[PDB]
Amino acid sequence: GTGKKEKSRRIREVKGENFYRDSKRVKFLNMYTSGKEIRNKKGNLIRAASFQDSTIPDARVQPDRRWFGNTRVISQDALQHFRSALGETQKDTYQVLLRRNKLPMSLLPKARILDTESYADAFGPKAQRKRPRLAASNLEDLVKATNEDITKYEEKQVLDATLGLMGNQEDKENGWTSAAKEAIFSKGQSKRIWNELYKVIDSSDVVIHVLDARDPLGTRCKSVEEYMKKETPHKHLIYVLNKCDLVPTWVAAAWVKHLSKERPTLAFHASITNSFGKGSLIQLLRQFSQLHTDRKQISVGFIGYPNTGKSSIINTLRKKKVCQVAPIPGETKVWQYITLMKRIFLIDCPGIVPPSSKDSEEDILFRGVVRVEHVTHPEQYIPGVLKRCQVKHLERTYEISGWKDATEFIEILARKQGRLLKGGEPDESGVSKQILNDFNRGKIPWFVLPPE
Ligand SMILES: Nc1nc2c(ncn2[C@@H]2O[C@H](COP(=O)(O)OP(=O)(O)O)[C@@H](O)[C@H]2O)c(=O)[nH]1
Ligand SMILES: [K+]
Ligand SMILES: [Mg+2]
C-alpha cells in the first residue's frame, strides 16, 4: 500500500487534507464545527470565539476632499434613454434582466382650503365665516340641485335597503344575533405560517405559485403577488396549474391561455408514477439556472393555498416521497429544503389563506382550506355542492337519482349507503361531511368555466 500514502499521492498529483478533500474544501467544511472559544486549565482564554472579540477599535473617519463631491452623475440623454428602455423592459414578465444588482435600478394639484381659512375662522366662538364660500348662482339652480340630490339619495337608499335594511336592521330588531364565525375557517392565518411564508419568499430566487386547475382564480393569492411586485421585484413569479387531470383538457388549455397573459404558466399533474408537465417544469427551472450564472445556485419556493399539491409537485420532480402529502390541511408546518440538483434547490412551504372579508365561509370551505370534520352544520353547505356539480356527474358517482333538493339527496344517499343512526334514522351530518370531502378530494368532477 505504498502507492496510497499521502506523500506518494502528493507526488502523483492544510491539516485534514486527503484524497477526498483539498485544502479549500477542508477549510470550508471546518465551518460547521467552528465558533467555539478556547480555554485552558487555568481558565485563561487563549483565543475568543469567531466574531466574538471584545476589543474596542479606534473608530475614526479620515478627512478627505472627496467626501463632499458628487458620487454618481448621468447626462440627460442617457437618463432618458435608460428610463425608456428599461421601464419598457420591466413590465414584461417574460423578460429577465441579467446582473440586476449592478444595474442602476434606483434611478427609476387641488389647492388646500386650510391655508387661506383656518379651523378657528370656519367655526367656533371666534369664527369670521358669515356667507357660503361658493354660493349658488341663483334660486332655480339650487332647487334643481336639491331635487336631483333627493332623487339620487332615495334611489341609493332603496338600493342598499335590499341588503341592509331587510338584513341587519331586522336582525337586531328581533334581538337575533348571527352565530359567531367558526374558528376553523380562520385556519392558515397564524403568524407562524406567515413568518414561514415570508422566510420562504426571502430565500427564493424563483417563486412558484401553485393554483388548482378546477378553481385557479379562487386559489390565486393577489396580495402576495402584489407584495412581490412592489417589494422584491427581482424575484421571478410563475404559475403552475396543478390537478389538471381532474378538469377536461380544453378547460386546462383555456385557463393556461388566460393565465399566460400575466406571467409564464405551466399545466401540471403531480404524481410519482405517471405525471404531466414534469419535463416542461424542469426545462423552465434549468433556464432560470443558466440565467443566474453568477450565483452558486438558485432556490425555488412553492406557495399557494393548502392542498394544491406543492409537496406533490416536489415529489414528482424528485420522483420520490421526499415530502409528506395528505388531503387534510395543515400537513406541512415548516419550510423544507430539497436538493433537486447542485444548482437548483426547492423549498416546501405551508399553505397560506390570505384574509378577505368578501370570501364567505362557504367559499373557503369549497376551496379545500378547512377540515370538514370540524364544521358544525355540514348539511347547510350541501346545497352549494348542488350548484357546483352537474346532476349526471352526481348520478354516476353515487348511483342515485330522483332527488328534488339537498335534503332528499342526503337522505337517499344515506339510505343507499346504510349510514343509519340508532333507530334507523339516517346519519345526515356524516353523509354531508363525506360529500364535502368527496367534493374537495376530486371524486366528484367539477370545474369553473374560464373567461371568454
Ligand atoms: N388528482 C390529483 N390530486 C392531487 C394532485 N396533487 C396533489 N393531489 C392530492 O392533494 C392532496 C394534498 O396535496 P398536497 O401535496 O399535500 O398539497 P400541499 O399541502 O400544498 O403540499 C394529496 O392527498 C394528493 O393526493 C394532482 O395533480 N392531481
Ligand atoms: K396538505
Ligand atoms: Mg405540502
Numbering used by the authors: 2 to 14, 24 to 118, 127 to 470
What did the publication describing this PDB structure actually write?
Biogenesis of the large ribosomal (60S) subunit involves the assembly of three rRNAs and 46 proteins, a process requiring approximately 70 ribosome biogenesis factors (RBFs) that bind and release the pre-60S at specific steps along the assembly pathway. The methyltransferase Spb1 and the K-loop GTPase Nog2 are essential RBFs that engage the rRNA A-loop during sequential steps in 60S maturation. Spb1 methylates the A-loop nucleotide G2922 and a catalytically deficient mutant strain (spb1D52A) has a severe 60S biogenesis defect. Nog2 is an essential hub enzyme that acts as a key quality control element during the nucleoplasmic maturation of 60S, anchoring both the pre- and post-rotation states of the 5S rRNP (Nog2pre and Nog2post) via extensive rRNA and RBF interactions.
Refinement of the Rix1-containing subset to 2.9 Å resolution shows that GDP-bound Nog2 remains associated with the 60S during 5S rotation and Rix1 complex binding, as the Nog2 active site in this reconstruction also contains GDP and lacks clear density for the A-loop. Just like Nog2pre, Nog2post is not destabilized by the presence of Nog2-GDP, indicating that 5S rotation, Rix1-complex binding and Rea1 recruitment can proceed normally in the context of Nog2-GDP. Because the presence of Nog2-GDP did not cause any structural defects or instabilities in late nucleoplasmic intermediates, we instead hypothesized that the 60S biogenesis defect of the spb1D52A strain arises during the nucleolar/nucleoplasmic transition of pre-60S particles. Our finding that the spb1D52A suppressor mutations sustain near wild-type growth even though Nog2 is GDP-bound throughout the nucleoplasmic maturation of the large subunit shows that although hydrolysis is necessary for Nog2 release, these events can be uncoupled without affecting the timing of Nog2 release and Nmd3 binding. This suggests that at a specific point in late nucleoplasmic maturation, after Rix1-Rea1 mediated removal of Rsa4, Nog2 binding to the pre-60S depends on the presence of the GTP γ-phosphate.
